[PDB]
Design a protein around this ligand. Sequence first.
Ligand code: CL
Ligand code: CL
Length: 124
Amino acid sequence: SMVEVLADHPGELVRTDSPNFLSSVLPTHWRSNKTLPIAFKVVALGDVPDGTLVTVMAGNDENYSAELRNATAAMKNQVARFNDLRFVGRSGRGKSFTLTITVFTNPPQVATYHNAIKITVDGP
Ligand SMILES: [Cl-]
Ligand SMILES: [Cl-]
């Protein structure tokens, strides 16, 4: 259930737009191609089988799909941990990217990260 998931990951997870998925926290603003401080995780709340692929894509109006690195992970015990997810493509100072999560169940489910993310050459 959701109480167990929160008891296994206390004060680490946050909501997505989808009631079936939670995720780890990402920085609001980060350096282009820099290693993340918290490794990305997608936690499923339903019965998602082991080996189910999760893919993340970043984008806005002027860039439908910004370049990423290691944007795919496999589900194991309801968690899909991204080994070294990095944001290469840059939103610039004027815009932020919306981060969309796709969990490849039959049929696939699409979820959105709760905040937009700003990606610049220097970062904060
Ligand atoms: Cl790009
Ligand atoms: Cl920039």
